[PDB]
């Protein structure tokens, strides 16, 4: 005769993968921007 709650904790899981889903998009993004710049010159 009593009753219980529950809680959450965010675990390295996100400490890494979610921060990586910023760093690893913008950085591959940096590679893609470089590609785009080179293609622009090539097309010219």
């Amino acid at each position: 005769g009593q009753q219980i709650f529950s809680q959450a904790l965010l675990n390295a899981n996100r400490r890494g993968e979610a921060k990586t889903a910023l760093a690893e998009v913008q950085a591959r993004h940096q590679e893609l921007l470089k590609l785009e710049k080179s293609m622009a010159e090539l097309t010219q």
Binding site: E31, L35, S38
Partner: peptide
């Protein structure tokens, strides 16, 4: 590794076209 390869090929092609 694929895209770097692509970048490398594009850079080579730019060189040939400048030539």
């Amino acid at each position: 590794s694929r895209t770097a390869e692509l970048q490398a090929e594009i850079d080579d092609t730019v060189g040939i076209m400048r030539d």
